[PDB]
């Protein structure tokens, strides 16, 4: 409804200053050519649902990297606020040490380009975007503020998009690794339909 | 973020002819005031990922209804094509008897209003939308065509939005019924962060 | 009133996936250079007048091919729906095996280019168009939905256009093969007028 | 599909001077409210196909008026040229006495309103339009200049439109008086399909 | 007030099919380079004032041609109607054989370019235009429909424009061949003024 | 066809200072309601063709007044130049005593409204206009500068328009008082055509 | 307020037919490069204040030519009216023989370019313009119609503009030849101020 | 002819702070209704020609006031600079005590509205304007910067406009009190032209 | 000079969530009617020059309040970041307890409305604004990022505007409470000038 | 809000005639490349606060030049008014001899380019601008008219910008020469924050 994020088309490019391993570092979408990217927005640092989502993704950052997928968090907060929040204990609502980059959308350009900017508050909705190695947007997930996303589901989607990528098949509803896929043509799809019904 | 579909705003209204218990009947968004709605688009009838999603939501339809949530499917196909597909055995790629309405979007107005129309093919992306009893859009999920959605995650989101709606709290990442929520203010949020860290 | 189908001018180009001999194949207008084309639209698959028209043209398919004319049916339905309709017995309202291509116009591009789209329903009127071997539109026939067309008249028109094309004469009202044509000049036409009055 | 001539919409209004029983008289579409109207354009008086179409319709004008349908011929020629042609014997290419009005479209307004004007020559194509008693356009037929229309098919279409009007059924391909029509709903339509297949 | 005919400027070019010696022929202004042209429009064939004007100019055609001036008649009627009028005896209101071309302005292009089209009826006023051998418009005469023109005055005007072209003098009111002219300068003009007063 | 001068429409209104009987007087078109008006423009005072036209109309003004027709001359010159020209003897190129008003079009409004202004020189062409007692323009005559007009033809045109006005018939070519007119309908017109051919 | 005459900028170029020594001659601004020009407009020939200004400037023409300044008169009247006015004795309100050119602005271009055209009357106000040898407008003087201009003041200005051009000093109020000028700088100007106060 | 300054039309309204008898006071055009006004612009305070003009008008102020005419000076300088200049002795290039107001056009609105703003420098040319008691502009005078104006000519012009105002006559070239005026009609003007030639 | 911030006009209205005494509280410009306001922006929380300015104004807060002036700080950081920064000890670069509100401009509306937004980084320049008790903007101070502002000068300016407000006088350069002011009129201003020179 | 002065961007270029050492000289921004520039506008010469700000900056001119900073004063008054004011003793409200250039902005270009023009009065606000040696605008100070600026704060700001320029650090609030600056990164800024707290 706003922005430029479109399924099947190149994901909107982004460049931003990020906090990587307690240090400031520039991050841009071009750095991930050939790797999947899970870009997820959150409204504000030092809030409530946001830390649980950042922590949950950081704890499982390696589960995505094993698959060749890098996870990126972003809010409109500056990299100094990110660093401060990272230097705050998790028991106090902080992030503690983080295994994923944390971008600073101080210009709001990323949130606007991805159409997740809640304009009346100038903060980003809980928008999650899955981008493939070729820089093409594959998936969009946006939540209202009071409800957090699921890292399990985001991982399942990355897996499904990679498995259908290389084997040229399509994944049924609820597909998880190890489950059958469908050969997307009239004749060969009968194998799946006759087996599972 | 989808055509006229904006989170926090009234969901785009819709009226369409649908197949309900094997017969044609009108379906309007106004029919579901006071109830949650999961509206999910799929590209084409008589294809491959689509019947598995439609069948999944139909099997789980009562799980949503016991929560006061009505599930609706929709594609650009006519109700006559829907009925023919319903009358095709699932063993042959059909749908069999269904427990959810199947809306016909032959004017492509629903797909266009919810910004899920793949313009170069004229079919809707795998867009899913969660609307609350007040008619407000709460969640947007759009997958590329090769990968199906998750009914389990859709149910979790409906559950989290209903719970946070009732108790004025917010659900952390991966929240499920029984898990703790967070009191969204600086002071009371410490109860959760200290308990879980 | 809408579209680009003008008599005497090149027929609007079209390109679409079609069901040919139970398989999906691409169909272009350019594929018929040098041959006549009867392109007839119909509103919806699995309806009532449409099967009788499609079946009637399929039975007479060779009556047009003997004359170097190819018949093509089209509707906004997909090739997967077309194929399902073909695989439905005629006694049950289906098409059965078909002797003509059945194009899918899911993007509504063909219907809009040929100005037959019923906007308020998103379906094509019963528009029929006759195109000569040079890609020029010779005839337009659009019926409202309740009334089916006449395969006999379509054959008569193709015959008349081919005859007048070759001999440079003009066919009178109700002309059929074996009937007198008129030499379109003041002097030579007197032959016809004196004879038939 | 013809200028302002759109199926299912009110036919473009017209008012023109016409030759009626050898005298000049004003004719307007509103004069035929409650009756069907067959309005056929032809390019030029004192030509070749045109007299055969006018004569054929004239000879069968009473077959249409027995159905409550009025036949009207139109061309850009003036009422004086019309009358001169009526006063020319048919053996010499004239029309002789006529049993249908012959409107004069000297301003080209009717031809432009019905989208049949061949602009590079200033003459009307061979457009035929069927209008019901409510003034709604039901059928469009347009031939290139060298081929004449069929009065039989025009009468069949009038009959079909009046029959489907009265009984709420739909007429299949090639339907003629006395043949079966289809009940346009899924269940009741099976009667026809099993009987005729 | 309308059109492009302007005195002292190149006369609007024209090209039309005409009846010449009982046959059809293309006529265009460029055909008359180096010759004077009298182009007279008339509203409708088979009317009342028009045949007398056409007949008059036809009878006087050689008076004009002896001065190197060609006379052309034109109306919006087609060449077929022109010929049928020519084949009507003058006793019955026809033209009989003609010695001037009769142009068919069926596209109304000529009438519009010369600003004589009576828009509310689609017919040309009684506009007469004199053009010199260089294509430059010299005279405009336009009569309302009920009053015919004067061939004597048309001849007189052609004679005047030709005499003044050759001798660089100007012709006073009512000048005819043999009358005195005025040398157009203050000193030499006194010769005429002192003699004629 | 001249600026706002359209045949059959109300003649462009005008208001100008004029020399009448050697004195200045305002003249306006409404002054001549119920009377015919011959309004003739001429380029310049103290030139060559112009005095011969003005003098000719002056010498014959009473011939027009006997018919209820008032003649009016006009040029872009001022009333003071007009008066000086009237006070110049005709032997010296002057006008001498005049019997018609001589209007001053110093603002060029009349020439512009009547479409006769030679823009590159700012002077009026030899435009003559006939207006009936109802203010409707009936005749346009415009000569190039070097050729003067004919008072004989102007009078004949006034006689013809008043006769056709009064008796509802049309005057044929070269019609003069005493000659036959044509009753403008198909049947009654045969009287004239058979009598005169 | 209107036109292009801007002091300090190149004077508007003009090109007009004029009366020079009883004969017609083209006159352009370029003809006067290297000389001063006093261009004075007046409303109408054969009026009242105008002859006194044209005569006054004529009788004083040699005083301007001795300075290298040419005096030009112009009105919207034609050259034929000018000459008639020149050929009118001064006792009868004429100009008699003139020693200055009298330009004809029949197209009103000169009056429009110099912004002195009294639009509602089509005549020029009493505008006077002083141009220098380089074609630069130096002075504008426009009187309402009932008040004549002053040749003395026009001469004083030409003298002042030539002296200040020559000596690079500025002339005080009322300066005439022989009076002191001011050195336009702070220090040297004190010479004048101390001496004249 | 200056910005909004049109002779014969209401002079552009103006209001501005002025120095009056050594104090600051608002001065607006409406203050002088019923009195003549000479409004003269000058470029810059503390310059060279400007003081001599201001002083010249100041000394002659009562000569204008005895005629019912008020004199106003204006520049883009502020009133404080005006006062400082007034407090500067004349021997030092100052104005000394002043008998006329000195307006401050700091916004340049007066200079722009009267079309005298030398834009490249931001100062007013030496524009003088005479306005009558009706608020109508009667005279425009604009000198280039090096040459000062004549207070004598300004007084003569005021005298001439007031005289022609009261007596309905017109003043010839160089008129001064005592000289003859002209009765502006053809007949009565003869008295003057005969007496003076 | 700042977006909508204009000296002498109503200051841009604002409304924002702010941290006050360690808690969140809405703050709007209307709350400070009758009181002066010092609104100072700073780029980012947890940076370097900002805390020194914020601390300096907080330490002097009562000096401003004793004068009836309220000091407000604002950055584009959220109120949660502000609080966290306030809860960081000053020795750690935090703010520690504050005695002034800390507004959050996360929508950037305040920074945009006051024209201090560094667009390329999305942060506010070191802009300080002084608003009087009537809501009018009186002073603008904007510093480049690397140079902090002066609380002494800000206080001096508030005192100067309050003093000049109540006595209708003007404060010289460097004025401080106790020093002399100037009566802003020519005569009375001499008291100050002679005394201090 | 108006103009083109933006912090951190090249200062708007300017060129003007100025009074330097009692003489006129052209001044432009390029003359000060590599030097800091303090450009301060003031509304009007011969007023009250303005002379005290000009004298204050003049007496302190060398204090700025010792730092390589040049001070420029500018108002809309002309250089002639500047010089008259300089030649007025300070005791009488004048400036006396000056040690800084005084620019003349008679075209208001500078004031408009720097967005300090009080448009309703045509005078500049008390806008002070600090431009560095590279021509980049570093600081904006705009005071309402009745309150004078502080030279001490201007000097302080120039010192801070020059120190931060050279040492790549940032100066805290109230910094003056000899005080500590801050190393602008998270790790090194702790040196300042722990020492001073």
From Swiss-Prot, chains A, B, C, D, E, F, G, H, I, J:
Keywords: Acetylation, Antioxidant, Cytoplasm, Disulfide bond, Oxidoreductase, Peroxidase, Phosphoprotein, Redox-active center. The active site is at residue 50. The modification N-acetylalanine is found at residue 1. Its main location: cytoplasm. Transmembrane segments: none annotated. Its EC number is 1.11.1.24. It comes from the Eukaryota. The modification Phosphothreonine is found at residue 181. GO terms for biological process: cell redox homeostasis; cellular response to oxidative stress; defense response to tumor cell; extrinsic apoptotic signaling pathway; hydrogen peroxide catabolic process; leukocyte activation; negative regulation of apoptotic process; negative regulation of extrinsic apoptotic signaling pathway in absence of ligand. It is found in: Cytoplasm. It catalyses: a hydroperoxide + [thioredoxin]-dithiol = an alcohol + [thioredoxin]-disulfide + H2O. The modification Phosphoserine is found at residue 111. The modification N6-acetyllysine is found at residue 195. GO terms for molecular function: antioxidant activity; thioredoxin peroxidase activity. The enzyme can be inactivated by further oxidation of the cysteine sulfenic acid (C(P)-SOH) to sulphinic acid (C(P)-SO2H) instead of its condensation to a disulfide bond. It can be reactivated by forming a transient disulfide bond with sulfiredoxin SRXN1, which reduces the cysteine sulfinic acid in an ATP- and Mg-dependent manner. Residues 5-163 form the Thioredoxin domain. One of its GO terms (cellular component) is extracellular exosome. Signal peptide: none annotated. Homodimer; disulfide-linked, upon oxidation. 5 homodimers assemble to form a ring-like decamer. Interacts with TIPIN. The active site is a conserved redox-active cysteine residue, the peroxidatic cysteine (C(P)), which makes the nucleophilic attack on the peroxide substrate. The peroxide oxidizes the C(P)-SH to cysteine sulfenic acid (C(P)-SOH), which then reacts with another cysteine residue, the resolving cysteine (C(R)), to form a disulfide bridge. The disulfide is subsequently reduced by an appropriate electron donor to complete the catalytic cycle. In this typical 2-Cys peroxiredoxin, C(R) is provided by the other dimeric subunit to form an intersubunit disulfide. Belongs to the peroxiredoxin family. AhpC/Prx1 subfamily. This is Peroxiredoxin-2. It comes from Homo sapiens (Human). The gene is PRDX2.
